[PDB]
């Protein structure tokens, strides 16, 4: 088989600056005698299915503009992206097509760069209301901040919680390229009602030290 | 033009089987291989496998070869992909793709809009509507709890308030149902005058619930 590995995972380039995604193959893709690179590479943007840009290493498909260019030869490729657009944000997939099974790169997700911003973090208790049912939700949110590398950490009366929280992360936003970060921690309304002080421990690199947002149940 | 049309998305259980589709039109579907490629979750491509139409000559990955069955109904131009039996474990997006032209083999030139595939124990609920309450920027938002299957919208003051907005990917709780946030930045000095109500539509389950947020008493 033919294994493909891309570099970087995930790319940060400033709008209108140069974007670089590298392709390597396990063993030569090189077609001979037709001496051509039997190499894809594929754009994906959320939500949609991936698209052609790039067939034979080097050749442009068409309608594809420009600013996309492919390179490399034999087992080591590389896109590039000559001044990076709005519209490039997305993931990119390589592909070899020199045999079967005809294998896919694991993708390299194209971010925008943007200076770091230290997220602000709230902390909300459950309502009554979802306590009336039997359980209560802790959220903790942090918002707009950059890098998307961020660590939430619960603490219940200076226990630290384990394995009771989810968290998500949203896309880039479309006005700032910042993201935003919302924990839940679960709790049954009997644990919730045992416990006095819920507090968020958020760690990130534009903050000099960890922040802690906490409440006093019942205050 | 070139299409690739597949079967809607599918919520199924464990243990049923599924035959899912995919179409092609403005050329000729014998002349052509199709590929099928899975996405599961926050995941990258995966090659499946590829089928022949014209001879049902069909080629599998490793990975995939006696988990599903790919084949093709050249008289209506369509392709296949089934499983006898759903696993949890199935959960992803499947596209179905065009091989190009080229002699030898070639890259895939068109794609389908893919298949969503669910595959759960969980059955049809809408979400309970809670409150996350306001503690010069002030942040509040709307807990989407206990909802089955995806999607859920939601809206602030009707779509009069986009500014500052995040809803969040959903997660997938232990219980089999989703839950989603979602939150609003604001001024301080508006929590007393602005009525801030966040609008749910939960499709699936035709329930849609408009609650309005406010500081606590």
């Known amino acids: 088989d033919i294994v493909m590995t891309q570099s970087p995972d995930s790319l940060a380039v400033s709008l209108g600056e140069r974007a670089t995604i590298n392709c390597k193959s396990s063993?030569?893709?090189?077609?001979?005698?037709?001496?051509?690179?039997?190499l894809a590479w594929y754009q994906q943007k959320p939500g949609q299915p991936p698209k052609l840009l790039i067939y034979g290493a080097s050749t442009r498909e068409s309608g594809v503009p420009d600013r996309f260019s492919g390179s490399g030869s034999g087992t080591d490729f590389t896109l590039t992206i000559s001044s990076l657009q709005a519209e490039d944000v997305a993931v990119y997939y390589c592909q070899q097509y020199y045999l079967i099974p005809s294998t896919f790169g694991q993708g390299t997700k194209v971010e925008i760069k943007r200076t770091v911003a230290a997220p602000s973090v709230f902390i909300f208790p459950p309502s009554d209301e979802q306590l009336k049912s039997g359980t209560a939700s802790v959220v903790c949110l942090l918002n707009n901040f950059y890098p998307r590398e961020a660590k939430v950490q619960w603490k219940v009366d200076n226990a630290l919680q384990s394995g009771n929280s989810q968290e998500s992360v949203t896309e880039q936003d479309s006005k700032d390229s910042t993201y935003s970060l919302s924990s839940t921690l679960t709790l049954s309304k009997a644990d919730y009602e045992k416990h006095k002080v819920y507090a968020c421990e958020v760690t990130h690199q534009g903050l000099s030290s960890p922040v802690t947002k906490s409440f006093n149940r019942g205050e | 033009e070139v299409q690739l049309v597949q079967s809607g998305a599918e919520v199924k259980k464990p243990g049923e089987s599924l035959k899912i589709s995919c179409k092609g039109s403005?050329?000729?579907?014998?002349?052509?291989?199709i590929g099928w490629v899975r996405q599961m979750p926050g995941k990258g491509l995966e090659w499946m496998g590829i089928?022949?139409?014209?001879?049902?000559?069909?080629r599998y990955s490793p990975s995939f070869q006696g988990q599903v069955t790919i084949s093709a109904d050249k008289s209506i131009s369509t392709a296949y992909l089934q499983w006898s039996s759903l696993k949890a474990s199935d959960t992803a997006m499947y596209y179905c793709?065009?091989?190009?032209?080229?002699?030898?083999?070639?890259?895939?030139?068109?794609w389908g809009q893919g298949t969503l595939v669910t595959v759960s124990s969980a059955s049809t609920k809408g979400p309970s509507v809670f409150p996350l309450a306001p503690s010069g920027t002030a942040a509040l938002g709307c807990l989407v709890k206990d909802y089955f299957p995806e999607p859920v919208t939601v809206s602030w003051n009707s779509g009069a308030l986009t500014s500052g907005v995040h809803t969040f990917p959903a997660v997938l709780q232990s219980s089999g149902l989703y839950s989603l946030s979602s939150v609003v930045t604001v001024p301080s000095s508006s929590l007393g005058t602005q009525t801030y109500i966040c609008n749910v539509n939960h499709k699936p389950s035709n329930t849609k619930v408009d609650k309005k947020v406010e500081p606590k008493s």
């Open positions: 089928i022949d139409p014209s001879d049902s000559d069909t």
């Open positions: 793709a065009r091989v190009g032209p080229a002699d030898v083999w070639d890259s895939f030139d068109y």
């Open positions: 063993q030569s893709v090189l077609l001979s005698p037709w001496n051509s690179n039997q």
């Open positions: 403005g050329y000729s579907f014998t002349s052509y291989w």
